[PDB]
Design a binder for this molecule. Sequence first.
Ligand SMILES: [Mg+2]
Ligand SMILES: [Mg+2]
Ligand SMILES: [Mg+2]
Ligand SMILES: [Mg+2]
Ligand SMILES: [Mg+2]
Ligand SMILES: [Mg+2]
Ligand SMILES: [Mg+2]
Ligand SMILES: [Mg+2]
Ligand SMILES: [Mg+2]
Ligand SMILES: [Mg+2]
Ligand SMILES: [Mg+2]
Ligand SMILES: [Mg+2]
Ligand SMILES: [Mg+2]
Ligand SMILES: [Mg+2]
Ligand SMILES: [Mg+2]
Ligand SMILES: [Mg+2]
Ligand SMILES: [Mg+2]
Lengths: 187, 175, 159, 168, 75
Amino acid sequence: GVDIRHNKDRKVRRKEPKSQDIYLRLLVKLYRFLARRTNSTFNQVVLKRLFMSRTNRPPLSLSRMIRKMKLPGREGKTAVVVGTITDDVRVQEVPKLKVCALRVSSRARSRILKAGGKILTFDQLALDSPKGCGTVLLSGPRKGREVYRHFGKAPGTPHSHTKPYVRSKGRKFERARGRRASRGYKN
Amino acid sequence: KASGTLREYKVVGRCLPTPKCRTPPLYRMRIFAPNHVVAKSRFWYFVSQLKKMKKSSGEIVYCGQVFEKSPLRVKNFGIWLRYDSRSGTHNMYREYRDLTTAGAVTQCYRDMGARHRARAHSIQIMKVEEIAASKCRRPAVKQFHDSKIKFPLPHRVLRRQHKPRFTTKRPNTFF
Amino acid sequence: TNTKGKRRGTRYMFSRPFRKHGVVPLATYMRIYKKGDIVDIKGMGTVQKGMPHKCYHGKTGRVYNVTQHAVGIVVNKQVKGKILAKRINVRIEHIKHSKSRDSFLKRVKENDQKKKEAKEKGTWVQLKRQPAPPREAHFVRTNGKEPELLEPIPYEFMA
Amino acid sequence: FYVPAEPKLAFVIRIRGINGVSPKVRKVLQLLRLRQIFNGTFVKLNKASINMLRIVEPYIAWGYPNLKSVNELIYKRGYGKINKKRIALTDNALIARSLGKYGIICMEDLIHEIYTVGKRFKEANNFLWPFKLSSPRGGMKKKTTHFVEGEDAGNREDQINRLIRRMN
Amino acid sequence: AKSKNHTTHNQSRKWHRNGIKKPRSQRYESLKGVDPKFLRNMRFAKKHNKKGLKKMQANNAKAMAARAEAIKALV
RNA sequence: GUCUACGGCCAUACCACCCUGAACGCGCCCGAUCUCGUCUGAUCUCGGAAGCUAAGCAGGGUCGGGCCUGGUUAGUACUUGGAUGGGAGACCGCCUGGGAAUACCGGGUGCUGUAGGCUU
RNA sequence: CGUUCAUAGCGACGUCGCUUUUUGAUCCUUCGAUGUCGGCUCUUCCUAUCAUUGUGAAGCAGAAUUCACCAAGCGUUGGAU
RNA sequence: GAAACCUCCCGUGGAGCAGAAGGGCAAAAGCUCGCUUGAUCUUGAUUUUCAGUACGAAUACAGACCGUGAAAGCGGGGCCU
RNA sequence: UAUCCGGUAAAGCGAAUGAUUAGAGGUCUUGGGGCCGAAACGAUCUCAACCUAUUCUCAAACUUUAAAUGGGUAAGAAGCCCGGCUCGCUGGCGUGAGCCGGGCGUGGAAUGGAGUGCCUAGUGGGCCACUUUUGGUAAGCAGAACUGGCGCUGCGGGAUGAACCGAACGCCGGGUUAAGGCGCCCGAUGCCGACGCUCAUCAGACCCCAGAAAAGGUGUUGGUUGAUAUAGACAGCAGGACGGUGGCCAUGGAAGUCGGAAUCCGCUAAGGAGUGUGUAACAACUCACCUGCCGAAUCAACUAGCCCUGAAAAUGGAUGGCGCU
RNA sequence: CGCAAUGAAGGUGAAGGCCGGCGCGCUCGCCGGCCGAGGUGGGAUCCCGAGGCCUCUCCAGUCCGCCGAGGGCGCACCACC
Ligand SMILES: [Mg+2]
Ligand SMILES: [Mg+2]
Ligand SMILES: [Mg+2]
Ligand SMILES: [Mg+2]
Ligand SMILES: [Mg+2]
Ligand SMILES: [Mg+2]
Ligand SMILES: [Mg+2]
Ligand SMILES: [Mg+2]
Ligand SMILES: [Mg+2]
Ligand SMILES: [Mg+2]
Ligand SMILES: [Mg+2]
Ligand SMILES: [Mg+2]
Ligand SMILES: [Mg+2]
Ligand SMILES: [Mg+2]
Ligand SMILES: [Mg+2]
Ligand SMILES: [Mg+2]
Ligand SMILES: [Mg+2]
């Protein structure tokens, strides 16, 4: 006999990607190797990000990316994003960049290259810089999905600012007994 | 406690010193016990019943075996007791006749087992005193106070009962 | 089943101890609690206004607010299987500075003294605490008198 | 009277198994790394350690080892804990690799530190994997009771070596 | 058919499966439930910290210069 | 040596009776015009300074009660954990660690902050 | 108490037991059902012995008799309601 | 007159505090007078039951406006449950 | 290791609340009933309540005391220590809080990789044991605490068995063990094992467990305490067992002898104002002290071990069986 | 369906800073210039890097690394303002 809980003895992270798009698996073949034979933690991370869900590698806006390279230090440097770049119509002056992402939506692509930017694929990124030397590995905001507004402490539970699931907001869908103190009470 | 064959142990120990008792008084005890590890336990048990002095308050200074300086003599021990009953405690005084104080102590314990179904933890030995031929009270012992002591060996039942398990000869017990 | 009333079973809890009834001795009030000060709560019968609930008696916590004559004072409270840090307003009377912390600080101050000193010297001193060790080798001298024998003593029925 | 030193170091053996065990016991026993029955460790005594070894009296047998006992354990049953994998200390270059920072570079140094309880005992000992002893050849007097009352449990100070012989 | 009324038997053991976690600590805890007047005032102190900046900057420059003079005298 | 005012801790400071109280104080004390208040200048309020330590107050006294703190009680009672220990049960003994409370017998009987006196 | 005499035979005040031919407690078993009272008939078992065998006891002179033992071999009946 | 009212002395509370009990309370939380309406107007926080939802109950604050007192303060109902 | 909390076991009741025995001391108070008093705190008792020291025994809903086990904090970088700013708060000046800027690293033992968020099924009849504990005469009863089991779980042992004791399972070879065992069934004592005890015409024979008590026993074996005794015993037979004396009370008769208060002297060698038996009552008989034969040791009361008595149920029957001394 | 919310509704509807000037800088009102989604702690990662560590000799000495004391910009997420 041996007292251990085997409850939490398997770990649940992904090894490989669950997708079957051959071009992603090829990338992974490359970065799996790079992330073993090198020391470049970057490669370890890049590789780890290539196994995640579409939810879990969210779209970086051009505008956010612009503002993350402006930052004082990373001038003459490459952006990297293991999801996708999107346009920002609510930004106007677009600096010249150097980016890697799996995708750069058509609009955002035009914008980058018109401004004299540069766009790289991952296999290109590996050739350039196999150690991820000279990079700013960014990410999209993980918490942007509307989904999260529903999680948390359940609504109607004091100091829960938690969007409830309702068919259709308006006068008569919730917002009575339990919110109007007049009607019943409130949280 | 339990048993096997006991020895004697001279345990000595002192409540370990404080600011208020810079050179505390040592105490000594004839423990009888199957080994030094238990001897020392046994020592404490007795000390604490007497003095305010627990193992943690104290130390054992010198625990060591005590050998019989008269092994090859045969001696009559008186031996005083304080066992427990299925009822209340009693005191006794028994006599044994042995070559060693240990021997006689062990030879006591056993007897108490037999004659009173008294387990060891029930028993406290208070003194063991080698004695003269005289002063001995118990005629069990005193029938062995004789110079021309003689006796036959009478219905001398065979052992080696299974060496020859089967055989020709019915045995013979007269010797 | 029992009553969920507030004071239930505080017959000997909020009970001013033998020959300590009557007036709340002023010191009690005129001593000062800041934010971050650690405090052991302990109810008191006489002052009822701002009496803490019976679960928090003996329980000890930190002071996160200070109103004119009260203190908000974060405490822990195990509820079944999930301790809640939680915050209770207590009037000064049912509250004392905990000394638990003072002895740590005393020791910090002693380390920072012994760090400043013994730096110029070169010798690094044992700052850490170290558990109560095995009690060393030593001699016991029994000057002259031999150790006293101790006979176990006979039973006799007293009563 | 030369009252000698109280012992620095004792070897500790879980002598009873892994059912029905009280909750406070079990914690302590797993702080000692005694999760199988008949495992054993070196434990540097001090008030803190001792009071823990009390609380598991009925489950452990323990005492103050010999030098020999140290060697016989460490050579025969001594395995390093190296990248969390249990590993047989076959060669010194395994001990060194992980305790070299401590001036412990060979089998011999490890024993030294365990036996004398040097500065680095914690990390040398930790690095040893809990000693998977056999069942005691010649068995036990009684698994249940304390040594003093005719059993095997509790502190038997010197004698613990006798037990180490039959179980290594 | 009467039935068991209540107990706490297996309850401990469940609690401890997943932990009895001592509730999560943080530096920078909230100012929720803090005697309003107090808060106001500090919020105000906070409000006008940027006023009295140029003075503070200057003071820190003089302190830095005094450190550099002290380090030069040492060396 | 010690007091007064405001105090902290709140009997080692309380209670009972006894002695002793220099100087300064604090008192009792002598008055009712005003202030103020009573059935009553007793209390309270006010104006005083002829007496006096009688009392309060202070210091001490008492094989004093009380309180305070030790010892004893007692390694007693109890008690954590242990055993295919005992015992028909009632219960008990052991191992492992923790350990009280009376009666009884000793010692103690206010310490002290701030401000201002007296003994020049 | 028994003329007297605690104990032939009894036995208060107290107390310790056994038994499951009383009744209670209980609700384990059975509600996709174990035929719900008596009597009749038949067998067997028990002894806590009414009788009979052999015995000890008496406040057994005989007669009748209780008290106790070994003992369950053999019996223990017909009728009115 | 055992009980009326008057007076002196003793009195750690043995009374009283609406009610059950328990806590608490003596130049008071009791009794007696004087004035009064904090038992009013309003944000949130927190406790208690708790799921840590409500209700009720309470605890601290904060802003109004008032009461009382020389004032310090105390009061937003009932000494507390 | 520091530091708080607590009012349970215990203890206490010559400390509060309540409960309660007894005598000492008190016209405290006064009484109700007396006896001696006209009546009288006169004398003498008494019982009522009250009091002074004492004393007997108590408390889940009492308590001065007061453990063990137990519950909180704390054991450093979110910490220490300097410098300066902000404030509409607070304030004689000052506090207190908030901001910047610099300076300082292991801060009890042992162990361990942590943190975190979604979706979420079954479940929400339970039962058993040690210890604690309420109801109840109890219960394989009902109801709680604590841990651990069973339920979900096999395996060795407990003959058999949910829950005991050991130990927790991938498939196997060797070795070893636990708990339990070792006449034979049945693996292992086919040891020249050790010391006792014990005989049962109902022997006994192992956690949970499946069965007995009070009370007895010259059965035996141990202890404990007293005794006895060559100044001549102990048993065994033999000799006497009286006088003051129908002793006093009791007459219904108690001269030792239904009962009861007494309970001494003489002679004594020694006999009780008497153990019984018996008397209406006596009488008569009987039961110490000492001798003779006799001749060294002997007796009593307790106590505890095994054995026995106490001990009765129904199909034939179960230390598991055979059997075992 | 999403890119806007909130309010019963009438309805309203997500920016702030700095600097210089003019109104009394009045922590209020009006005119010019610059920056433009704030800050604190923690934060995978990136960047700089004193310094070593050798080279068959005594020094000079560019190239390549390995590590890196120390310092930075700091995603996402969290806590807080
Ligand atoms: Mg088990
Ligand atoms: Mg039931
Ligand atoms: Mg239910
Ligand atoms: Mg006057
Ligand atoms: Mg005077
Ligand atoms: Mg005087
Ligand atoms: Mg005194
Ligand atoms: Mg067990
Ligand atoms: Mg009669
Ligand atoms: Mg049928
Ligand atoms: Mg019969
Ligand atoms: Mg008043
Ligand atoms: Mg207000
Ligand atoms: Mg009132
Ligand atoms: Mg209680
Ligand atoms: Mg009690
Ligand atoms: Mg089920």
